[PDB]
Structures are given as C-alpha cells and as structure tokens.
Structure 1
C-alpha cells in the first residue's frame, strides 16, 4: 500500500465522480491533513489556472504526472477538443494518474505517455501526430528542465508564443534552467512567487514564452 494508492483511494471515497473540482479539493485535503505529497498544490494551482485561462492552449505537454493532480487542474480548463499529453516515467504513478483522470471524467482529454522525456520528446511528431505545442508544463526531474527545453526546440516542437510553465524553480530549484531562459533572447520570462505545495515554504512558477530562434 503506497502513499499514491492512499491518495487515489481517498479521492474515490471523498470526491464526486466526474467532478474535477471535488477531486482537486480531496487531494489537497488529504495532503494537508494526512501526508504531504509532491502535487503542484492549490497555491501554485491557482497561478496555473490563471495562466491556462489566459492562453486557452489547444495542445499541452506535461513532463511529470505523479498522481494526475496537475493533469486534472489543466484538463478541467481546456476548451472542447483541446488535448493534454502527460509524460510519466514511473509506471506505478502512471496507473494512479490514469485512475485519477478516469474518476474525474477527463480521460477523453488526456493521454499518458509511458517513458522518459529524452526518449518520448523525439517521438512526438511522427508517433503522436504533434505539429507544435501551445504550452509545456515542466514538473519532472529538476535537472531535466534545461535539457528538455533544448530538446523540444531541436525537435521543432516550439512555436512563436509557446508557453513554458515550470514548477519548483525555487524548491527544489532549477538554477540552470532559470539562468538560461532569463538570459536568452528566445524567451520572455515572468516569475510567479508562491509557496511549496502544502507548506509555508517559498517556491514559484516560471513562465517562459518562446520567441523563436
């Protein structure tokens, strides 16, 4: 019995099926009252919602699904026909995420990609019929934000206006990614100061809009 299994069971027994909002509130209650977990959380989740609403992206790529908290948060705000691709290296987490999406009634909007980002990013065009991405949500290995950003550009997956949104730029922190995007003429950056999920600890999101090469 894992923490992720306990989160999924709590949602199933405390949220309303097909109600994404109740699923998010059930996750946040469980993680505030029982066991901390690396979901983006409500504080940064509110910033994510404001960003999703501004850009109304048609195709979103998420790197790191975990229990599906951020996939539910983003997918519930997507327009009819808009899609989310979420990459998850951990098969146990990928099965929790699918079950979370199923319970929330968002399964038709989200596709889980099983594997490592360095292996899956180059397959996006020919295997997943992707042209360019509207938005990218980075929430995987912190040391991969920079290489994956560079790999997405190499693969021709970024367009003028592609919104990159990165979690945990303060804690655990992504110093090379932050130094790179902020220093690059190919990105327009904005920092959104917030708090680490379920904790009185400063964290933040970085928005980096791709401007072309």
Structure 2
C-alpha cells in the first residue's frame, strides 16, 4: 500500500500554505497525530530544537536522518539568511520526499540534502563539501550510529569547542551508550530535556552535548 512518506507529503500539499514553514510543520503533526504515528509527531521535540537554534544561532548545522523533512523545515525556518543545513539521508526515497517538502516550504536554498550513509558522508565533509567545523549537529538517525558517528565527527576534526550536539530519542527506544559517553566525557557538557511521546504515553528525551575541544593528547 501507500507509504507513510508519500501520504505525509500529500497531506502537506493539500492542506498547508506554500512558503509558510509553520503551516507545513503543523500539517505534518496534525496528520501524524490522526494516524497515531507516535514517532512522527514532532511538536514536543520541536520546542526543544527551536530553543537550541534560538540560543546558539548556528551558521552551519548537520542533521543525521531527514525522513520527510519535518526537522529540516523546523530548523531551517529559524536559520538566518545565508546559513546552511546539511542533512544526511541514506534512503533516496526519503531524500526525494524531503526535497519536495523543502520546496513547498520555500526553504530549499538553505538546505543541502546529502544522499548516503552518515558513516560514508561524514569523512567527505572536509574536502568534498568544504566544511571547516559544524556549529550544531542534530542526531536523529539509526540509534546504534549515534555514538560511532560522534566519534567519527571528532576524529575527522569536524567539531570545535562550542559545537552543539542535540540528539533525539535518547530514551525511547534509547541511545544509552551515547549518553554514557557524552555524560562521562570531559569533552562534553550535557543537558537533558524531556519530550513526550503520545499513545505510548512515555517521556522520551533529547540530550544537548556541547563539545569542549579534545581531551589532552596525554594521560
């Protein structure tokens, strides 16, 4: 039958207002609430995301996991003129829907969708995509890659003192090894934010982990 993704874009095109990102977000959340797709209702986590963007005003953001573009629209609508979101998405069909979603929102010029696995694209950011360091990273992809990809970002020199990591779904279904790492590491200062999931009626959360620079090269 019809995919969730094609139906979400359909609903937006039929109900939201072109070039009104807020209306696009609200349409996605309205439809996904009606369908009882708990992981696709983004307004609770979106309050936390918005606060992070408003406080830190990042010029260059990396997103891991685009899906249909909800979080890309959510962040890009608050980015300044000339700022940039790079979003990595392994599934080309999701990349395609995300592109259409951004076009409808009028935010396509602020976003570059990178089609591939985060583990393959991250090592290309420096030379192929001319990245110095990221101002913010939003982690929202496969749970078992949150910690590995954080370590990879570190190794590739893509984090600087002050880079803000914001990770979704750290409680449900959970990213406990990622949490133990950033909370235990002197290279990250961490804050936890609770975020509700409907239907399951559970308190998920997001973790903000601000990189402090690398640990001493010595013991």
Q: CA deviation at 1:85?
A: 0.1
How has the CA–CA distance of structure 1 residues 161 and 75 changed in structure 2, closer, same or farther, with 3 Å as cutoff? same
Per the normalisation by structure 2, the TM-score is: 0.94
Cα deviations across residues 92-133 of structure 1 (Å, max 9, x unaligned)? 111010000000000000000010011000000111110000
Secondary structure in 1 aligned to 2:127? helix
Per the normalisation by structure 1, the TM-score is: 0.97
Q: Distance in 2 between matches of 1:176 and 1:110?
A: 30
How has the CA–CA distance of structure 1 residues 45 and 197 changed in structure 2, closer, same or farther, with 3 Å as cutoff? farther
How has the CA–CA distance of structure 1 residues 167 and 197 changed in structure 2, closer, same or farther, with 3 Å as cutoff? farther
Q: CA deviation at 1:199?
A: 5.2
Q: Distance in 1 between matches of 2:78 and 2:64?
A: 18
How has the CA–CA distance of structure 1 residues 204 and 188 changed in structure 2, closer, same or farther, with 3 Å as cutoff? same
Q: Report the count of equivalent residues.
A: 212
**Greater Cα shift, 35-44 or 124-133:** 35-44
Cα deviations across residues 140-189 of structure 1 (Å, max 9, x unaligned)? 00010000000000000000000000000000100100000000000000
Q: Distance in 2 between matches of 1:147 and 1:37?
A: 26
> Which runs of structure 2 are paired with 1:134-149 in the superposition (5 Å)?
134-149=135-150
Alpha-carbon RMSD across the aligned residues, in angstroms, is: 1.2
Cα deviations across residues 62-90 of structure 1 (Å, max 9, x unaligned)? 00000000000000000111000000001
Q: CA deviation at 1:193?
A: 1.0
Residue in structure 2 matched with residue 77 of structure 1 by the alignment: 78
Q: Distance in 2 between matches of 1:51 and 1:103?
A: 25
- Alignment gaps of 5+ in structure 1: none
Contact 2:65–2:87 at 8 Å: present in 1 too? Answer: yes
Contact 2:88–2:115 at 8 Å: present in 1 too? Answer: yes
Residue in structure 2 matched with residue 177 of structure 1 by the alignment: 178
Secondary structure in 2 aligned to 1:126? coil
Q: Distance in 1 between matches of 2:104 and 2:35?
A: 21
Structure 1 segments of 4+ aligned residues over 3 angstroms from their partners: 37-40
Contact 2:33–2:41 at 8 Å: present in 1 too? Answer: no
- Alignment gaps of 5+ in structure 2: 214-219
